[PDB]
Amino acid sequence: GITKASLATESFISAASFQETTRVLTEAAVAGKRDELRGLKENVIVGRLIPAGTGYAYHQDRMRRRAAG
Amino acid sequence: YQDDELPVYQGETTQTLQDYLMWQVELTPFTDTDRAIATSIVDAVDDTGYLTIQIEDIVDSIGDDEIGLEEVEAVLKRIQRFDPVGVAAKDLRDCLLIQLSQFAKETPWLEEARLIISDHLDLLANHDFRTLMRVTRLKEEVLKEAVNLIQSLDXXXXXXXXXXXXXXXXXXXXXXXXXXXXXXXXXSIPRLKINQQYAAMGNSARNDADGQFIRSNLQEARWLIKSLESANDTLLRVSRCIVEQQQAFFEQGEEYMKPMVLADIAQAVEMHESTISRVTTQKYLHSPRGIXXXXXXXXXXXXXXXXASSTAIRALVKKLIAAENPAKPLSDSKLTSMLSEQGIMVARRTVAKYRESLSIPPSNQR
Amino acid sequence: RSPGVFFDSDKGKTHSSGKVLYNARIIPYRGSWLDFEFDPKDNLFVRID
């Protein structure tokens, strides 16, 4: 029902500005979550290229390096 | 549209802009080391931009490892042209030499006189021409357009500056004279400290929490109020007491000044010297003369039993040497004797230094 | 609003049970305001400031 949807996401950086920052930073700080920067808003905030459209090409290539080192 | 309290916000002051030469070099098409050498040059540029350190000190401070001076020299001459008509290079010659190179490159009697005047004899021709007119071979007023063109030649830099920090005194402390008495009335007085305590008192009962907060919200706040209102009242009372003590003790309207030992003024209120002398540092005084509550507390024994310190003497000495020398006495000892005729017991040896000090032309006026 | 006595019906929606609640407010020109209210318990209650 979308009220807990953004709050239940597996990335702590995203949706933190969408709702109260206190509970997100406390639960994430105690849990030790890793964002992995797989979200769109996270790449927009950090400034990295968007993993969609023309960028989806580039982010695909680097992807095959991830598991390959 | 007043928006309540108004913006009143940090604001991120955007002025800065002390030196744009870094942004100028950032656009210069250098190769590799010329950028680092340029950054080494622009760091030594003085705020005036006339004579900056020594050319040898730069190269000695680069950590050369070859890279001879023929390169960094071309970097100097290279940046001086891209500069606002010039920067640094010192020598006092290179400024006027570069200013005249790209300015015009023609007029009657520009380069012909400018090369010799700029090269040599400049300092000899600065005071007056006279016999130099026979050295330059020019005839009578031909050089009038030349020197007249140099006058407009002009500190070389200091064009941008953009220093909004003018540093104003504003209010501080004030005194007034009236009804036969030039007595300061402490003419500031925001009353905010007085008003705030009165206003804050209303604030303490305004929590509207229902938690009462008697233990922390109420007693602590009261303590802070007593603490800041009492401190502001004590500071204002001390400043008013010192302003009245200095007011009554010495009179500005009367000619000359009376020396005050830090102790006499400290002995009037029976307070320690450090406490009052520290209060008189950053606090000024505004009356209907001049524009400091520090120069009016000058202490000196005047080296004589007949009379006042040095302020009276200094003003008087400049008032003496002001109109004097009908011919060309260019004399300090004569001023020390004329000052000694009034019973001031001036040494006449160290007198010239005092007289010379603070823009006085002496003794170089000879 | 002018100072005086205001009899208000509050619209009768509070506990969702559909019970009407009539309150009143005596407001002076200056000083503390005095309010009288009814709870669903059918008892009189007073709210002062």
């Binding site: - | 003018x166 104003x168 005194x169 524009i291 | -």
Partner: protein, 49 residues
């Protein structure tokens, strides 16, 4: 304000939505011209020097 002679039609599609077209005669006659006045201030203050 100032009166004008109004004609109601489209003219070569130059009027679109709520927009309007004006003749040069209004410009030549000086009609619809205003004057503004701006205050400039410079302060001279006594500094520490």
């Amino acid at each position: 304000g100032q009166n004008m002679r109004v004609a109601f039609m489209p003219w070569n599609g130059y009027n679109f939505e709520d927009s309007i077209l004006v003749s040069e005669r209004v410009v030549q006659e000086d009609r619809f011209t205003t004057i503004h006045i701006q205050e400039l201030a410079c302060v001279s203050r006594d500094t520490k020097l």
